[PDB]
Design a protein around this ligand. Structure first.
Ligand code: CHL
Ligand code: CHL
Ligand code: CHL
Ligand code: CHL
Ligand code: CLA
Ligand code: CLA
Ligand code: CLA
Ligand code: CLA
Ligand code: CLA
Ligand SMILES: CC1=C[C@H](O)CC(C)(C)[C@H]1/C=C/C(C)=C/C=C/C(C)=C/C=C/C=C(C)/C=C/C=C(\C)CCC1=C(C)C[C@H](O)CC1(C)C
Lengths: 225, 201, 201, 202
């Protein structure tokens, strides 16, 4: 073994070309304001960390809302009962839940996602990433900063951040984040009140808009009065 | 003294429990208070005169039918509707209340300019430019009347919170819960109803 | 490091989630922990001794009947009560409760003058002047002992919140839930109970 | 531009890659055509939701002989449009009133006829800014941005009307009917499956 240290000179498989900002110069005409650009309309700004906490809950709630949406669209199972499928016992069922899946997580027969297997992989993968994101563990990518919700190095392979206007993209993500978190809260409250999935509640509300509302179900007590 | 009870008004001193924070919180406290005054008073009066619970009053007017509301007024000399049930409607009441309340709110806050064209100032509570056709505000002790208003604000809101939790637990009505309490003070209270499980345990 | 866990003692730190605000908030925290600690250990002991869940222990003692409490206490030589006479009554205890706790409260907080009048200062959570006859405050690393007590305070309150939410969900009791979980942890959990429903789903 | 991110551009914003902007009268024409298209697409949207008649068939309901069918077509109406006993919105009646009202408005919009108002309202300006905007939404809002919004709605709705006319010519089913068929099953209900069926001609 000798030291080569040649020039890689590799380019991204996709590298978004400069597209700039696709938003008006005004960036938060909506209620409230992005952090670091004005005063919080109602709730007090708890801490500098709260902005990054908002971003993380936002991205997680985006992913959760889209997961509940796609799971109910593809299987019809509500998200709040999808946990009962994969359990220490009979986690075989959870396998075939993806429409068009060429193959099952559980091949026919014994072959299957075990709860503990899935769980052990889940801890070892997600916790590792969670730690690497925060100050726990260490930084495997020194070029990026732990504790920054917008690293933008290897984590933007397409380079949309640099291709456009960075801060308008940031606020766009923030607005999507807040929208999805509020939608997630609506989904949990709907699950509590109606015991039916989000897309089921949507379908009931669009089939007969005038009925199948909060107040319609309240007339029946949300199945509790 | 001015505020001998627990806590203090916005100018009196530091808040005991929740820090004061933004100045707008006082304005929200007054507006919420006034709305709770109206709400508690309405819930009382409707339950005393008619007997329907305030929380189920929502189901009573609906776009399927909103004629049960008509004529359900104590001592009503003048009927709310014609004999025709069709003329009164849930959406008819909804549209006019939307436009009226939206105008009132927008004028109070400054989303749209004041039609009154008076010294009444947006982002302000009880300007008193025209809202007080009688000058007992300025004739009487305006500060004393303000602290009295605020004490009633906090009382009415705390009572409204109690009313909603009683509706969630007792499911009988605020005034009806009052009647049960006085009828049997010792066998009808929170702790007895908790022993009954609030209808769920 | 004295406090290696997530948060830190008030004397030094930032209070990451909720801002620190007033120091009266820290006073409340300690007192809430010192109380909830006694509450959690009492619910533990009541469940172990009598099998009665804490959240319905008040059903036991009522204005008409407060005699059942006498035979509950395990291993007692004679009952609590005059046997059949059962002098202890809900009101008999209540008058005693209100007077004794009100005196203890007021002499704590300084609403009334301190009877001990021994240089003790009201509004301090750790007097260390008379309430430590054993001298463990005087001896040892007193600050380290404040840390341990705090840690126990926060743990006990979190366990109390768990106990109330388990009473609401499981409806079984804290130690009964503990025994169910220990007998079978895999198929007796919060998520197993959610799958079965909490009695409402 | 920053504000206008659509494929093309607004007149005065720059120059279009294809058929670049020529006379300003073209820009006036675009805005007015848009405005009438917004009205037209909304009418074709709302009418067949109310009563189910495609807009390209709604014309023949009123005819010089009989125009009773158009009366009582609007959903929710408290009463007939004209007496229930004898509806009187005859096609000629409609015409004689509408030609005069629309001709007046048009000539007064373009100023070929002397304006009635003479309130400073300058013809050949797409944005009169006078009585036409009583709310004066433009005054509070940012007028440049709002102009861009107006043109974006103009182009979108004109494209939607082009879609309505070509869907009528291909499928002769109706705009919301085509919508409902596509939402029912877009994969097996779209332009290309209607092409496989042959657009009703082939
Ligand atoms: C290669 C063939 C194949 C085909 C035609 C489909 C087709 C579909 N999949 Mg499936 N899938 C396929 C393979 C696979 N899928 C999945 C896992 C998923 C997921 C996780 C999701 C889909 C979803 C969808 C739908 C998305 C439509 C668009 O957008 C559609 C019904 C999406 C869906 O259900 O939308 C409602 C979705 O969220 N598929 C896996 C495992 C990685 C596959 C591996 O072969
Ligand atoms: C803006 C103030 C306002 C408030 C606080 C309420 C609150 C209520 N309404 Mg009313 N309403 C209000 C205005 C109006 N309502 C109605 C028309 C109705 C109808 C038609 C119905 C209600 C019902 C209800 C209840 C539903 C509880 C619920 O959502 O689940 C619990 C939610 C919470 C506790 C929130 C946290 C509750 C008492 C429903 C009802 O009575 O069911 C029992 C019902 O069917 N409301 C109109 C139109 C004229 C209003 C106009 O401003
Ligand atoms: C001051 C502290 C204290 C606290 C926290 C409680 C708490 C409780 N008591 Mg007790 N009690 C307390 C002091 C006393 N109780 C009693 C006598 C009783 C009786 C007689 C009864 C209770 C009951 C209850 C429960 C009522 C649940 C409820 O309101 O819904 C939940 C409320 C919240 C979550 C709000 C926060 C709950 C476990 C009742 C019970 O067991 O119900 C099943 C009951 O019947 N208590 C006396 C004697 C005068 C006390 C003296 O201080
Ligand atoms: C009590 C009176 C009254 C009520 C409740 C309605 C209610 C309705 N109308 Mg009708 N209308 C009424 C009187 C009248 N309408 C019309 C002319 C129209 C038009 C032009 C339209 C409606 C539309 C609608 C619908 C609105 C749905 C959305 O929004 C709904 C069925 C709209 C519709 O079709 O939405 C589906 C619509 O575009 N209505 C006229 C004038 C001839 C009326 C005169 O009083
Ligand atoms: C009658 C409507 C109308 C009018 C007058 C204009 C006029 C204009 N547009 Mg607008 N535009 C329209 C519709 C219209 N457009 C629609 C529907 C779209 C969306 C696709 C756009 C999208 C658009 C963009 C994206 C841009 C313009 C631009 C322009 C300017 C360039 C010069 C030009 O093309 O004028 C001549 C007017 C035409 C309409 C061109 C003719 C198009 C041919 C004839 C094809 C149409 C086929 C027809 C619909 C067939 C129907 C058959 C059916 C009846 C059976 C001018 C101000 C440019 C500009 O201002 O740049 C600075 C610009 O960037 N327009
Ligand atoms: C947990 C998620 C989360 C987090 C961490 C934040 C944090 C923040 N937001 Mg965001 N936001 C969120 C949710 C959240 N928000 C949602 C869902 C919306 C849409 C409604 C918004 C809309 C929004 C706007 C419009 C603005 C902010 C602003 C801010 C900042 C100031 C507020 C603050 O520090 O106190 C945070 C304190 C709280 C989150 C406590 C509120 C708790 C209430 C009671 C909600 C509880 C939810 C639910 C009922 C719990 C159910 C429990 C379950 C068991 C049933 C801060 C960065 C402002 C800003 O950046 O200032 C410059 C600003 O202008 N946010
Ligand atoms: C929404 C109504 C409202 C509002 C806006 C305020 C606002 C204010 N109050 Mg008022 N107050 C209220 C309710 C309210 N209070 C009620 C009901 C009472 C009677 C119990 C009081 C009694 C009171 C006193 C005695 C004092 C204040 C003070 C203050 C100031 C302190 C800052 C503050 O509270 O933070 C804004 C409010 C919050 C952050 C509240 C968050 C909610 C809390 C944690 C829990 C409430 C439970 C909630 C209702 C549960 C709903 C569940 C249900 C939906 C199912 C501020 C002007 C202090 C002051 O003026 O000091 C200078 C003071 O001394 N208020
Ligand atoms: C009991 C609660 C209470 C109290 C003490 C006050 C006290 C005050 N208010 Mg507030 N107010 C309240 C409730 C209250 N208000 C409610 C519910 C509303 C919403 C409608 C308002 C809306 C309001 C505005 C918009 C303004 C005030 C102003 C004032 C001051 C003027 C003097 C006054 O109103 O005399 C209080 C007199 C009484 C409490 C006597 C009893 C009156 C009872 C309730 C019957 C009223 C009958 C009435 C004449 C007709 C209505 C009947 C209907 C069928 C004073 C600080 C003004 C101010 O401060 O400007 C400097 C001001 O601008 N208040
Ligand atoms: C009511 C009791 C109580 C009180 C008064 C406090 C007060 C304090 N704690 Mg302590 N703490 C408590 C509970 C409490 N904490 C519990 C249970 C835990 C265990 C998780 C902790 C763990 C803890 C740590 C680890 C740290 C603190 C810190 C602090 C300080 C910062 C926060 C502040 O000022 O706002 C106080 C505000 C509140 C107490 C309001 C909390 C509101 C939420 C919504 C409560 C959620 C649970 C609620 C009861 C659910 C409702 C149940 C109901 C339906 C039945 C302050 C001195 C920090 C500190 O000292 O920084 C230097 C610190 O590092 N505490
Ligand atoms: C509502 C109602 C209900 C009844 O039931 C029936 C009813 C018929 C009475 C009906 C009435 C409706 C009414 C009155 C409608 C009015 C419609 C109007 C004014 C339509 C205008 C339609 C305009 C089109 C297509 C433009 C096409 C132009 C195109 C693509 C070029 C685009 C172009 C350009 C310019 C430059 C760029 O660089 C790039 C490219 C090359 C893309």
């Amino acid at each position: 073994r000798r030291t080569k240290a040649s020039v890689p000179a590799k380019r991204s498989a996709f590298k978004a070309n400069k597209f700039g900002s696709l938003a008006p110069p005004d960036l938060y005409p909506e209620f409230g304001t992005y952090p670091g650009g004005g005063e919080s309309p109602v709730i007090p700004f708890g801490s500098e960390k709260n902005a990054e906490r908002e971003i993380i809950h936002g991205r997680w709630a985006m992913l959760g809302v889209t997961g509940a949406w796609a799971a109910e669209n593809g299987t019809g199972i509500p998200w709040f009962t999808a946990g009962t499928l994969c359990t220490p016992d009979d986690c075989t069922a959870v396998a075939d839940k993806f429409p068009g899946a060429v193959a099952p997580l559980a091949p026919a027969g014994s072959g299957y996602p075990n709860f503990w297997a899935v769980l052990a992989i889940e801890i070892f993968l997600v916790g590792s990433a969670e730690c690497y994101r925060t100050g726990l563990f260490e930084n495997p990518f020194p070029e990026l900063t732990q504790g920054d919700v917008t690293p933008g190095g290897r984590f933007d392979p397409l380079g949309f951040a640099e291709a456009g206007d960075l801060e308008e993209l940031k606020i766009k993500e923030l607005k999507h984040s807040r929208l999805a978190m509020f939608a997630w809260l609506g989904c949990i409250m709907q699950a509590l009140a109606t015991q039916e999935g989000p897309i089921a509640n949507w379908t009931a509300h669009v089939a007969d808009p005038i009925h199948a509302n909060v107040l319609t179900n309240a007339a029946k007590g949300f199945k509790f009065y | 003294d001015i505020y001998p009870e627990f806590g203090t008004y916005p100018g009196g001193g530091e808040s005991p429990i929740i820090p004061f924070g933004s100045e707008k919180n006082a304005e929200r406290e007054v507006i919420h208070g006034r709305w709770a005054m109206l709400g508690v008073t309405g819930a009382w009066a409707a339950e005393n005169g008619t007997g329907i619970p305030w929380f189920t009053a929502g189901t009573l007017c609906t776009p399927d039918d909103c004629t049960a509301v008509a004529d359900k007024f104590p001592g009503a000399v003048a009927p709310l509707a014609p004999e025709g049930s069709g003329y009164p409607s849930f959406w008819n009441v909804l549209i006019i209340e939307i436009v009226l309340v939206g105008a009132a709110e927008a004028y109070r806050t400054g989303i749209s300019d004041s039609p009154f064209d008076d010294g009444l100032t947006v982002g302000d509570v009880n300007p008193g430019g025209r809202f007080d056709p009688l000058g007992l505000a300025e004739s009487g002790d305006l500060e004393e009347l303000k602290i009295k208003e605020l004490k009633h604000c906090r009382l009415s809101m705390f009572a409204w919170l109690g009313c909603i939790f009683q509706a969630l637990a007792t499911q009988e009505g605020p005034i009806a819960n009052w009647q049960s309490h006085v009828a049997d003070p010792v066998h009808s209270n929170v702790l007895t109803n908790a022993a009954k499980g609030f209808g769920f345990y």
